[PDB]
Amino acid sequence: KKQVEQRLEFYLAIQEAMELYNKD
Amino acid sequence: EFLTFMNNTFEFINKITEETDVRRNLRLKVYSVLLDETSDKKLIRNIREEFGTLLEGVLFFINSVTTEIKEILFKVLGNVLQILPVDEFVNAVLPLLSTSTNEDIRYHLTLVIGSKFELEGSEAIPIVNNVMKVLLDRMPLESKSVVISQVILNTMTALVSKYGKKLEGSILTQALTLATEKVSSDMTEVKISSLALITNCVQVLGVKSIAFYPKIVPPSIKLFDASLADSSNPLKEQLQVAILLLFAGLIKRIPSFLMSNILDVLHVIYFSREVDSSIRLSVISLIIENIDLKEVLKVLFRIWSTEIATSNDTVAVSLFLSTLESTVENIDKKSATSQSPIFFKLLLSLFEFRSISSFDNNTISRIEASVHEISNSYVLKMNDKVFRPLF
Amino acid sequence: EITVDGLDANQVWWQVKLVLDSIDGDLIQGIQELK
Amino acid sequence: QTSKYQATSVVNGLLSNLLPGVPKIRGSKAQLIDRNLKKRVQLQNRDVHKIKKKCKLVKKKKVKKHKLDKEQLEQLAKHQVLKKHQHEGTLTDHERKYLNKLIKRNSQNLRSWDLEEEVRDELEDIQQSILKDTVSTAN
RNA sequence: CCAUCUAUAAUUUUGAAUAAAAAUUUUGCCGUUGCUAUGGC
């Protein structure tokens, strides 16, 4: 069963500019 | 306590404004009122005025904010911006630009105006004409603030870039005059934004911008010389590219009018150290395919003996070799024979580079190897009569 | 307008080229009607 | 920094507009010379036209989507607008026409279900015959 | 491929020094164990 289990597993820019200005 | 409370309020504001039925959606209710012919115009004016206060209020909180609450205001802001159409948004926002007394809110307000036109088309042509005039009028007022002056220039750059030709000519000419004056601004930010507008404005106007040509090219060349001196400038790379893109733009739009100053263009390309070689080489491919080769060959001799021969700069020498070889493989047979005395005069100078060259043997041999191939290529595509005297 | 201020002899002449070339076609057609 | 980011944005945008292929802004000298000479021919071979095409289509699809949001939104309001005027008897001349077209549109469809007149002639003739025997009522 | 010429690295002069400058000539991934060696896939 463990062998089967292994087989199972195998198969906004305006916001950013706004935030950047706040850092300034 | 209060921080947790305000977080919940802006969440509560966010839920109502969220566009999760005609009755529930605020956005649909607004447009219906606009669509109604019977709806009182004064009621419409109230909606415009109410939005401007609403838009200013949210921007005030975002300006004066907390990471999560910062994000929530943006969801609120995103909902707000979509409440009303582009037509009324511009009407309800442009007056607020002058009304607003805070530089931040004005800085924020300019950005959103550009975003509203990012996704618009031909239907906004009357609106953008109104926007351009307002942006033009506010700039003398906003000269004090670099950030506001920079952004307003760039929003115009976006609007001129997009359906700029369809814009009325007076605004386009007015913008070019305004951008040209601010090329002399001491702030590097204003220069680069000023340079960008001229490119788009010259692109739209084409030959009609020739009237401003004495005010564009000569100052730009002087700016480049100052650009080399101030190597401590943090925006040296962007500025140097900004000068290069200016020449590249007009090399496609006004080739014939630039040939007289083509030498200074080449000087900018050769010695623009900050700019990447790919940009510099790419603009060279523009010169060859747009400007007459015969004028180019004449200039290569002058620039070589003046600067490149004594430059002792690998990039400048190599890129000069790129210009020379490209021209010969594209120059016509008739043009080839006519410009023979100049090339050979240059060719003798190229052999004698070893005497003055400060580089090592391997470079000079490689440089000579290129020179020989080009010299063979050019002597081919010629006739005996022209070559016998030169030999 | 043909701008002559702060422009070399060549650039002015290119201004004359674009104007004169465009006007030639209409000028020739008007001549044909008159003849 | 905003000056920095905004400086990069404006320059980067035009690089795409004018030089589609060139990258954006963010040893022995003999080897350096060879690289630049090599870089030309391979840049000379670049298919910039396709790069322009790809950008154009991407901008077109989004812009196409946003109008499709715009019109689709306004008929919803337009129909909402029609509803209250009709209830309040505020119909305009145009409003009275669009509804009148709907009368023609909806009615026109029901004719197909109503069937054509000729078959009714045979059907009705059969109808009375089957009725009379079943209902009787002669007595 | 060979030579040659560069490149990289090392000793040396001015040099507090940086600096230039002549001059010369154990793993694909994951651990443990030292300051090196071996466990799993």
C3: which chain B residues are within 8 Å (Cβ-Cβ)?
210-211, 213
Residue D104 CB neighbours (<10 A): 9
DSSP letter at B185?
A: -
Q: How far apart are CA B367 and CA B319, in angstroms?
A: 11
* φ/ψ of residue C7, rounded to 5: -135, 145
For residue B124, give both structure tokens.
Answer: 């906004």
Closest by CA position to B245, among listed D24, D74, D128: D24
Q: Any CB–CB contact under 8 A between D1 and chain A?
A: yes
Measure B362 CA to E5 C1' (Å): 7
Query: Which one-letter DSSP state was computed for residue D100?
Result: H
Q: What angle do CA B196, C17, B294 make, to 5 degrees?
A: 75
Q: How far is CA B293 from CA B252, B270, B330, D55, in A?
A: 15, 18, 8, 32
List the Cα angle D48/D49/D50 in 5-degree steps: 90
Chains that touch A (3 or more CB pairs under 8 A): B, D
Q: Do chains C and D touch (3 or more CB pairs under 8 A)?
A: no
Taking the C-alpha atoms of residue B13 and residue B9, their distance in angstroms, rounded to an integer, is 6
Contacts of B236 (CB under 8 A, 6+ apart): B227, B230, B274
List the structure tokens of B88. 């009324």
Interface check for A24 against chain D (CB to CB < 8 A): the answer is yes
| DSSP H/E element including D26 | none
Determine contact, residues D20/D51, Cβ cutoff 8 Å: yes
Q: What is the DSSP code string of B113-141?
A: HHHHHHT--GGGHHHHHHHHHHHHHHHHH
Range list of β-strands (E), D49-118: none
Q: In the structure, how many helices (H) and strands (E) does chain A have?
A: 2, 0
Name the amino acid, one letter, at B32: S
* Closest by CA position to B323, among listed B254, B270, B248, B257: B270
Q: Which nucleotides of E are covered by protein (CB under 7 A)?
A: 5-8
Q: Looking up tokens 């090219």, which residue turns up?
A: B217
Residue that is written with structure tokens 């715009």 in the block = D70
Instruction: Determine the Cα angle at B248 with ends B244 and B250, to 5°.
Output: 120
Coil, strand or helix at D79:
helix
Q: Does D10 contact B285 at a Cβ distance shorter than 8 Å? A: no
**Cα end-to-end span (Å), chain A:** 59
CA gap B133, B129 in Å, rounded: 6
Q: Is the Cβ pair A18, B108 closer than 8 Å?
A: yes
In DSSP notation, B346-368 reads HHHHHHTHHHH--S-HHHHHHHH
User: Residue A15 and residue B65: Cβ atoms within 8 Å?
Assistant: no
Helix and strand element counts for chain C (H, E) = 1, 0
Q: How far is CA C14 from CA B201, B253, C2, C20, in A?
A: 21, 14, 10, 10
CA gap B172, B200 in Å, rounded: 10
Method of determination? cryo-EM
User: Looking at this protein, which amino acid is placed at residue B60?
Assistant: F
Closest nt to residue B360, judged CA to C1': E6
Sequence-distant (6+) residues with CB within 8 A of B223 are B183, B191, B239, B243
